[PDB]
Curated annotation (Swiss-Prot):
Topology Cytoplasmic: residue spans: 58-76, 186-188, 264-269, 360-374, 424-453, 501-548
Residues binding dopamine 1: 16, 86, 248
GO function terms (MF aspect): actin binding; alpha-tubulin binding; beta-tubulin binding; dopamine:sodium symporter activity; metal ion binding; monoamine transmembrane transporter activity; neurotransmitter transmembrane transporter activity; neurotransmitter:sodium symporter activity
Designated gene of the protein: SLC6A2
Subunit structure: Monomer. Can form homodimers in the cell membrane; homodimerization is mostly mediated by cholesterol and lipids, and regulates neurotransmitter transport activity. Interacts with PRKCABP.
Family: Belongs to the sodium:neurotransmitter symporter (SNF) (TC 2.A.22) family. SLC6A2 subfamily.
Effect of residue 90 to A: Decreased norepinephrine uptake
Residues annotated as glycosylated: 125
Protein name (database record): Sodium-dependent noradrenaline transporter
Binding site for Na(+) 2: 14, 19, 249, 281
Length: 548
């Protein structure tokens, strides 16, 4: 049972809300197949080494994202930045679960609300295919999602978000209460019910793929998926999106991996964990893209519109597609219930992990918080509840888009780049390899060390620079955000990006001694500060820097 339980755990942890909800619309927005080349390249080159490095760090040091930097005290700022990024993401990661809960609640009927027009929320322009460069938006499913769930028609933009919707308010309240009561007692919350949540997503994806392949218009969608438009690979939007989606789905850059590995056994095999998780994530992403493109090709055939204009490119793509695929099934009510229960469970577990990252990171830093986990959990959950209250308004989709674009974009890329640079160069790739050997029994191969030291940081810096200089103003379908919205988004990104130099400056000023003494104390492990007085620093010799 050692291997079967491990396989269940790894397959459960290998699929996130990202793979199911965010990958579809990022793949649709980027042409389809053309998005998989950057995705797979980045996956290997950066994602696999960074996943492995974070797991090894957490396992060896037994600390959260913040306090794990006792090895290189100057990067506690990086730790704080990743914790803040996780906190930001949790603001809308819960609104998505609220949407899923609302859909599940509305799915308990023999006549699904997303099948035809004729309801209170339908506009006079609603078009029913059975009864008779834009994105359409006049279909029963799109009309339902945008009017009877979001009530987006009552807001003119991000300047007129309006008051919170009370149905989504109740759903968010339920989600937050469940999260708190699942986090308040301790980290140990697995091995009890995750069995169903680890297999259900794969079953749902399998059934959807099998059913969608046999649809009238699925062939065109599959052709559009397997057709690669190489012109799109010279714009850098696809590359930025692929990198960000990778660091989202894999879980790196949020401090989740370090916090969760801090509870692993000292002899746990992180290399096999990273390899298996990366392979599963790649296969799942490819299958999900295939099924999504099949579904939207079927819809394009159904609605007599081009595949590029059939559906939205925003965060509601799954809530438009999956109900439309369910409506084509027999006993569609049961399938809808099953799918949305799956989505609820997956989102709940993912948000639970994201919030546990923050809780552990802050509790390891301050012992008072670690002594009062109940109050700290309540405070974190209440803050998330309010800042997600901000995202359930009538124009809440615009705020959600702004967050999903800015909270972890260049910010998460920069945080991961700083993590990699810090460890590999200042702490030492040789030291990290020695630690991994002492931990798991074998030294990492040359490929891993090269990826950690040279390849991954270079690509991360390149993508960060390109995202900064090649920045497209924010938009949501046909709505162009005003400039101050972009300024606010860049301020949000900087809020977590700037914690690195700020903490470096604070650490330098707070330390006592000469400039060289300050540097030595800053770039030396906290448990080896007794060598600073002996003027024996490895970082001050060229051998340390040229070591690979
Ligand atoms: C952006 N989000 C927040 C990242 C979440 C990462 C994740 C995680 C933690 C440790 C790992 F080794 C691997 C993945 O946290 C828990 C979890 C649960 C599921 C489920 N079902 C899926 C992923 C995770
Ligand atoms: Cl993904």
């Amino acid at each position: 049972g050692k291997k079967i339980d491990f396989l269940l755990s790894v397959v459960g942890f290998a699929v996130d809300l990202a793979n199911v909800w965010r990958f579809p619309y990022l793949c649709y927005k980027n042409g389809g197949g053309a998005f998989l080349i950057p995705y797979t390249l980045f996956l290997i080159i950066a994602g696999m080494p960074l996943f492995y490095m974070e797991l090894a760090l957490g396992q060896y040091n037994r600390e959260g994202a913040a306090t794990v930097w006792k090895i290189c005290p100057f990067f506690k700022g990086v730790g704080y930045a990743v914790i803040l990024i996780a906190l930001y993401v949790g603001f809308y990661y819960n609104v998505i679960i609220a949407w899923s809960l609302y859909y599940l609640f509305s799915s308990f009927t023999l006549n699904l609300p997303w099948t035809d027009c004729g309801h209170t929320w339908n506009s006079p322009n609603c078009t029913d295919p059975k009864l008779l460069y834009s994105k359409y938006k006049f279909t029963p499913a799109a009309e339902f999602y945008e009017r009877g769930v979001l009530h987006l028609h009552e807001s003119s933009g991000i300047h007129d978000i309006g008051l919170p919707q009370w149905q989504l308010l109740l759903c968010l309240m339920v989600v937050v209460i469940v999260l708190y009561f699942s986090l308040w007692k301790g980290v140990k919350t697995s091995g009890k019910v995750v069995w169903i949540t680890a297999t259900l997503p794969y079953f749902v994806l399998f059934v959807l793929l099998v059913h969608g392949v046999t649809l009238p218009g699925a062939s065109n969608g599959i052709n559009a998926y397997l057709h690669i438009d190489f012109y799109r690979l010279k714009e850098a939007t696809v590359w930025i999106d692929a990198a960000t989606q990778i660091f989202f789905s894999l879980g790196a850059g949020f401090g989740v991996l370090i916090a969760f590995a801090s509870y692993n056994k000292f002899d746990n095999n992180c290399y096999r964990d990273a390899l298996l998780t990366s392979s599963i994530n790649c296969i799942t992403s490819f299958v999900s893209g295939f099924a999504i493109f099949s579904i939207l090709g079927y819809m394009a055939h159904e609605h007599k519109v081009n595949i590029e204009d059939v559906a939205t490119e925003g965060a509601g793509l799954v809530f438009i597609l999956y109900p439309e695929a369910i409506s084509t099934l027999s006993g569609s009510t049961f399938w809808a219930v099953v799918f949305f229960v799956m989505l609820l469970a997956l989102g709940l577990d993912s948000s639970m992990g994201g919030m546990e990252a923050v809780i552990t990171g802050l509790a390891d830093d301050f012992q008072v918080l670690k002594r009062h986990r109940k109050l700290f959990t309540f405070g974190v959950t209440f803050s998330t509840f309010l800042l997600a209250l901000f995202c359930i308004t009538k124009g809440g989709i615009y705020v959600l888009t702004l967050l999903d674009t800015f909270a972890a974009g260049t910010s998460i890329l920069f945080a991961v780049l700083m993590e990699a640079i810090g460890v590999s160069w200042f702490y030492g790739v040789d030291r990290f390899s020695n630690d991994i050997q002492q931990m798991m029994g074998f030294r990492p191969g040359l490929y891993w060390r090269l990826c950690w030291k040279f390849v991954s940081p270079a690509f991360l810096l390149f993508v960060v620079v390109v995202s900064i200089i090649n920045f497209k103003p924010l938009t949501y379908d046909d709505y162009i955000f005003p400039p101050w919205a972009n300024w606010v988004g860049w301020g949000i990104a900087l809020s977590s990006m700037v914690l690195v130099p700020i903490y470096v400056i604070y650490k330098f000023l707070s330390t006592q001694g000469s400039l060289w003494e300050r540097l030595a104390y800053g770039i030396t492990p906290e448990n080896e500060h007794h060598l600073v007085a002996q003027r024996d620093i490895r970082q001050f010799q060229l051998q340390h820097w040229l070591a690979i």
